[PDB]
């Protein structure tokens, strides 16, 4: 599913993302925009550490597969990785909320640091009535 921008801004608002952990709605929109272009089915393989990023927020398999040995130290999600590719984003959001509490917060995603941080994020929500 590829979300239209306001449709996603309103869905994220309804799910409790606005201000979650002090993270603004415009920041969550900016992230999803750069990470997946608002596509739920987006997947990205990391050759570097033999891991896969799933869905709208490009959440790492560490959180849904949970590497079977030498597990880093993450706030794993209570779902299988496939749950991160479905049309209804609720599972995905619940999982992103887990992720965000990890020691890197939103700085965990590089795309956010490069494309969103200190940048005008307003644009992503303008005229969505959120």
UniProtKB/Swiss-Prot annotation:
Keywords: Amyloid, Amyloidosis, Antimicrobial, Bacteriolytic enzyme, Disease variant, Disulfide bond, Glycosidase, Hydrolase, Secreted, Signal
Catalysed reaction, written as an equation: Hydrolysis of (1->4)-beta-linkages between N-acetylmuramic acid and N-acetyl-D-glucosamine residues in a peptidoglycan and between N-acetyl-D-glucosamine residues in chitodextrins
Disulfide bond residue pairs: 6-128, 30-116, 65-81, 77-95
GO molecular function ontology, one term from the record: lysozyme activity
Gene Ontology annotations of biological process type: antimicrobial humoral response; defense response to bacterium; defense response to Gram-negative bacterium; defense response to Gram-positive bacterium; inflammatory response; killing of cells of another organism
EC number: 3.2.1.17
Cross-referenced SMART domains: LYZ1
Active-site residues from the entry: 35, 53
Enzyme class: hydrolase
Main location: secreted
Database matches in InterPro entries: Glyco_hydro_22, Glyco_hydro_22_CS, Glyco_hydro_22_lys, Lysozyme-like_dom_sf
Annotated coiled-coil segments of the chain: none
Location within or outside the cell: Secreted
Membership in a protein family: Belongs to the glycosyl hydrolase 22 family.
Subunit structure as annotated in this protein's UniProt entry: Monomer.
Disease cited in the entry: Amyloidosis, hereditary systemic 5: A form of hereditary systemic amyloidosis, a disorder characterized by amyloid deposition in multiple tissues resulting in a wide clinical spectrum. AMYLD5 primarily affects the viscera, and the predominant clinical features are renal dysfunction of varying severity, and intra-abdominal bleeding. Inheritance is autosomal dominant.
Miscellaneous comment: Lysozyme C is capable of both hydrolysis and transglycosylation; it also shows a slight esterase activity. It acts rapidly on both peptide-substituted and unsubstituted peptidoglycan, and slowly on chitin oligosaccharides.
Function (record text): Lysozymes have primarily a bacteriolytic function; those in tissues and body fluids are associated with the monocyte-macrophage system and enhance the activity of immunoagents.
UniProt protein name: Lysozyme C
Organism: Homo sapiens
Gene: LYZ
